[PDB]
Design a protein around this motif. Structure first.
Motif, PDB file in Angstrom:
ATOM      1  N   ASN A 118       0.812  -1.226   0.000  1.00  0.00           N
ATOM      2  CA  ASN A 118       0.000   0.000   0.000  1.00  0.00           C
ATOM      3  C   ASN A 118       0.845   1.276   0.000  1.00  0.00           C
ATOM      4  OD1 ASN A 118      -2.528  -1.326  -0.046  1.00  0.00           O
ATOM      5  ND2 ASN A 118      -2.586  -1.475   2.195  1.00  0.00           N
ATOM      6  N   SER A 119       1.676   1.438  -1.027  1.00  0.00           N
ATOM      7  CA  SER A 119       2.669   2.517  -1.048  1.00  0.00           C
ATOM      8  C   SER A 119       2.075   3.932  -1.111  1.00  0.00           C
ATOM      9  CB  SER A 119       3.687   2.304  -2.175  1.00  0.00           C
ATOM     10  OG  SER A 119       3.069   2.389  -3.447  1.00  0.00           O
ATOM     11  N   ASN A 120       0.796   4.038  -1.465  1.00  0.00           N
ATOM     12  CA  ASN A 120       0.127   5.339  -1.532  1.00  0.00           C
ATOM     13  C   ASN A 120      -0.808   5.637  -0.352  1.00  0.00           C
ATOM     14  OD1 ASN A 120       1.415   6.074  -4.054  1.00  0.00           O
ATOM     15  ND2 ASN A 120      -0.035   4.709  -5.091  1.00  0.00           N
ATOM     16  N   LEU A 121      -0.798   4.758   0.648  1.00  0.00           N
ATOM     17  CA  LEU A 121      -1.557   4.964   1.879  1.00  0.00           C
ATOM     18  C   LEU A 121      -0.608   5.412   2.992  1.00  0.00           C
ATOM     19  CD1 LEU A 121      -4.334   4.637   3.465  1.00  0.00           C
ATOM     20  CD2 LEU A 121      -3.693   2.241   3.791  1.00  0.00           C
ATOM     21  N   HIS A 122      -0.830   6.618   3.511  1.00  0.00           N
ATOM     22  CA  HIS A 122       0.103   7.231   4.459  1.00  0.00           C
ATOM     23  C   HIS A 122      -0.522   7.685   5.745  1.00  0.00           C
ATOM     24  CE1 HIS A 122       3.430   7.120   1.610  1.00  0.00           C
ATOM     25  NE2 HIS A 122       2.616   7.623   0.668  1.00  0.00           N
ATOM     26  N   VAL A 123       0.188   7.441   6.844  1.00  0.00           N
ATOM     27  CA  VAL A 123      -0.176   7.977   8.155  1.00  0.00           C
ATOM     28  C   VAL A 123       0.786   9.108   8.534  1.00  0.00           C
ATOM     29  CG1 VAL A 123       1.212   6.357   9.544  1.00  0.00           C
ATOM     30  CG2 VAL A 123      -0.872   7.367  10.520  1.00  0.00           C
ATOM     31  N   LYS A 124       0.294  10.051   9.330  1.00  0.00           N
ATOM     32  CA  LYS A 124       1.137  11.067   9.944  1.00  0.00           C
ATOM     33  C   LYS A 124       0.717  11.231  11.396  1.00  0.00           C
ATOM     34  CE  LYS A 124       2.710  15.847   9.734  1.00  0.00           C
ATOM     35  NZ  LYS A 124       2.380  17.243   9.333  1.00  0.00           N
ATOM     36  N   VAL A 125       1.700  11.343  12.285  1.00  0.00           N
ATOM     37  CA  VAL A 125       1.428  11.666  13.680  1.00  0.00           C
ATOM     38  C   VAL A 125       1.265  13.184  13.782  1.00  0.00           C
ATOM     39  CG1 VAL A 125       2.206  11.488  16.075  1.00  0.00           C
ATOM     40  CG2 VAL A 125       2.717   9.645  14.467  1.00  0.00           C
ATOM     41  N   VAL A 126       0.072  13.618  14.181  1.00  0.00           N
ATOM     42  CA  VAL A 126      -0.255  15.043  14.258  1.00  0.00           C
ATOM     43  C   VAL A 126       0.269  15.649  15.556  1.00  0.00           C
ATOM     44  CG1 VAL A 126      -2.096  16.781  14.216  1.00  0.00           C
ATOM     45  CG2 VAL A 126      -2.293  14.734  12.807  1.00  0.00           C
ATOM     46  N   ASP A 127       0.054  14.945  16.666  1.00  0.00           N
ATOM     47  CA  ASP A 127       0.581  15.369  17.959  1.00  0.00           C
ATOM     48  C   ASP A 127       0.714  14.225  18.963  1.00  0.00           C
ATOM     49  OD1 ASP A 127      -2.027  14.949  18.805  1.00  0.00           O
ATOM     50  OD2 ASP A 127      -2.359  16.988  19.521  1.00  0.00           O
ATOM     51  N   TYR A 128       1.259  14.564  20.126  1.00  0.00           N
ATOM     52  CA  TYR A 128       1.648  13.598  21.138  1.00  0.00           C
ATOM     53  C   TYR A 128       0.967  13.859  22.473  1.00  0.00           C
ATOM     54  CZ  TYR A 128       5.282  11.373  18.346  1.00  0.00           C
ATOM     55  OH  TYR A 128       5.960  10.641  17.399  1.00  0.00           O
TER      56      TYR A 128
END
Ligand SMILES: OC[C@H]1O[C@@H](O[C@H]2[C@H](O)[C@@H](O)[C@H](O)O[C@@H]2CO)[C@H](O)[C@@H](O)[C@@H]1O
Length: 627
Positions: A475-485
């Motif tokens: 799934n090379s076009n499916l991305h996660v990002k951590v917004v905050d902690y």
């Protein structure tokens, strides 16, 4: 006996100390000891099937560490007595498997409700009903209603009596944009005692006329957690040679599992991928997605003229439970009594594992899920929509503001269950799924030099998985990002728990991932060092969202006027607080008011029942696996 089993006992004692206030006078656990809290329940001394499932889990682990199964037994005893609607609560008659319910659309905003019933829209057949009645001799649905007003704070009582504790209530009914702040709390048993002329019914569903009726809503993730917990109680008691004490309680989980199959079906039993509300209904298992959906629900007229049952078209990965599914499918102690129960769960286990894999991002985090009802109205998917057995990918199933998969918590909760399943079975697909997810977890968790820690709090998503065809593509076009902690202690513990079961699995089946064990141990150690207090463990959290107490308008249709049991007037323009004026009696109300009037975010140190449970369970898990 060891450091970690002792940690469990200490916190267990805090939880069970009657003066600490984790439980009500009937021994029902609250959502949290503190009353001023709003997140999924809108008041702290409400409770959930989630809380009850964690209660069963805590006592199952107590049974492992002590050999004492009384606590597990009373946990189940309380669960069945109060959280599952009794025969009186759900007097179901005149159910028609060929016409299980009548269709109503879902709508993007609360101001589009009540949703009109559409009497010409075809609904499919329910293939479970007849088997279950034949098996159990009853029409009683053996599942937990998800939300309870434990001490009758709202004032609906039991079956409209206005007094009794352990009151069945509901909130969420008005689509993906109805946040916890925007609901109208209402009784599950509707006699028109409160609300408007038709009680609360015509805020939610538009009809030509209205009948007094009951309805309940199951949260499939909680029922599965209770089954998962009971599986472990079963194997642990069998090990101690005490299986027989808890035998009829193992049977409770098996029966709950039998009914939980309703969660595996489309809302209105429409065929998978149908993409047309006017399409003919399913004829049976062609409408089963075989996953644990957002809910199942069932209702009936008080007189008994009619009844209904729905599943759900929306599925979130955060709800899935391969451990429970495996147990119900394969473990002979746990297998449901119905002819097709075990077989259905075998199908579900396989489908669930595929679902997790399909949703795995390029980085390793698990994406939201899928729906069989685009916009909740069986609409056509946009061109290029990624699909899974005819269901359309959704980054945030069921809720959009904020998104249901913007919460990191589901990563831990759900992958903990996969980790257990892998530890037990050595499933190669589960192992590969976990390895990539653990790799991702290791890259995002902060172990600070000064001894503190931070875990992801909010996530953001982009792209889509590849359409599912039985194999993981990366799934090379499916991305996660951590917004905050943040320092969410329940989730931190759940994450540690997951990492531990995975680590133990790799020792058993492959190359021991010591790093995963060490990441988990550190999390539990640093937490223990830093966050112990009088009633358990807690970390400070600011809740700037609490300005919504004062500022959030609750949608009410113009001309619609009703009243809450305490006398609060329900009409257009009311705020969250206006229909919950008893909140002004709360010991923390001055504190909230002071913070709000001053333009400051109020700060809390909460003792959520499930969070304390996750902490106790995670520490004990280290002892059980690495002690
Ligand atoms: O809805 C899932 C889960 O949420 C829990 O509250 C969350 C809240 O949603 C989040 O915004 C906040 O930052 O942290 C807490 C984590 O405890 C809630 O306690 C659960 O009942 C609920 O099932």
């Amino acid at each position: 006996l060891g450091e970690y089993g002792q940690r469990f006992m200490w916190l267990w004692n805090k939880i069970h100390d009657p003066a600490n206030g984790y439980f009500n006078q009937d021994g029902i656990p609250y959502h949290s000891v503190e009353t001023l809290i709003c997140e999924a329940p809108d008041y702290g001394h409400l409770t959930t099937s989630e809380a009850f499932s964690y209660y069963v889990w805590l006592e199952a682990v107590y049974g492992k560490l002590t050999g004492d199964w009384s606590k597990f037994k009373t946990a189940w005893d309380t669960l069945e007595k109060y959280m599952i609607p009794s025969a009186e609560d759900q007097p179901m008659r005149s159910y028609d498997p060929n016409k299980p319910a009548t269709y109503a659309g879902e709508w993007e905003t609360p101001d589009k409700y009540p949703s009109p019933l559409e009497f010409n829209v075809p609904v499919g057949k329910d293939p479970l009903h007849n088997e279950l009645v034949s098996t159990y001799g009853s029409t009683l649905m053996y599942g937990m209603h998800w939300l309870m007003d434990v001490d009758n704070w709202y004032g609906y009582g039991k079956r409209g009596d206005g007094v009794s504790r352990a009151s069945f209530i509901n909130t969420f009914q008005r689509g993906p944009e109805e946040s916890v702040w925007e609901t109208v709390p209402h009784p599950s048993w509707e006699e028109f005692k409160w609300g408007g002329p038709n009680g609360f019914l015509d805020l939610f569903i538009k009809d030509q006329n209205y009948s007094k009726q009951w309805r309940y809503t199951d949260a499939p993730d909680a029922d599965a957690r209770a089954i998962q917990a009971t599986y472990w109680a079963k194997v642990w008691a069998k090990e101690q040679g005490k299986f027989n004490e808890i035998s009829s309680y193992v049977a409770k989980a098996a029966k709950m599992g039998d009914y939980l199959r309703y969660a595996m079906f489309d809302k209105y039993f429409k065929p998978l991928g149908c993409q047309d509300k006017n399409a003919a209904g399913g004829t049976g298992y062609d409408s089963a997605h075989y996953l644990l959906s957002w809910y199942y629900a069932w209702g009936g007229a008080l007189d008994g003229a009619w009844s209904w049952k729905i599943g759900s078209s929306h599925v979130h990965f955060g709800y899935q439970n391969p451990m429970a599914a495996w147990a119900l499918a394969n473990d002979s102690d746990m297998k449901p009594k119905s002819p097709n129960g075990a077989s259905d769960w075998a199908k579900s286990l396989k489908r669930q594992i595929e679902f997790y894999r399909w949703l795995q991002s390029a980085e390793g985090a698990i994406a939201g899920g899928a729906t069989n009802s685009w916009n909740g109205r069986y609409e056509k998917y946009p061109a290029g929509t990624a699909t899974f057995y005819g269901m359309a990918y959704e980054p945030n199933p069921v809720y959009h503001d904020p998104g249901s998969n913007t919460w990191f918590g589901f990563q831990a909760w759900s992958m903990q269950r996969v980790a257990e399943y892998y530890y037990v079975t050595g499933d190669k697909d589960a192992g590969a799924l976990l390895e990539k997810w653990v790799s991702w977890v290791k890259s995002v968790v902060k172990l600070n030099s000064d001894g503190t820690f931070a875990i992801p709090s909010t996530l953001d998503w982009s792209g889509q998985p590849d359409t599912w065809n039985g194999a993981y593509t990366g799934n090379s076009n499916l991305h996660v990002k951590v917004v905050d902690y943040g320092t969410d202690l329940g989730i931190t513990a759940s994450l540690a728990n997951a990492l531990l079961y995975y680590s133990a699995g790799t020792k058993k089946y492959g190359v021991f991932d010591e790093g995963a064990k060490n990441l988990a141990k550190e999390l539990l150690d640093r937490m223990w060092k830093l966050y112990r207090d009088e009633k358990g463990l807690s970390a400070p959290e600011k809740r700037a969202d609490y300005k919504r107490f004062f500022e959030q308008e609750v949608y009410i249709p113009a001309g619609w006027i009703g009243k809450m049991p305490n006398g609060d007037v329900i009409k257009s323009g009311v705020k969250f607080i206006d229909i919950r004026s008893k909140y002004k009696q709360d010991p923390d109300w001055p504190k909230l008011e002071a913070a709000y009037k001053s333009g400051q975010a109020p700060e809390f140190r909460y003792h959520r029942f499930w969070a304390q449970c996750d902490i106790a369970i995670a520490n004990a898990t280290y002892e059980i696996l690495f002690g």
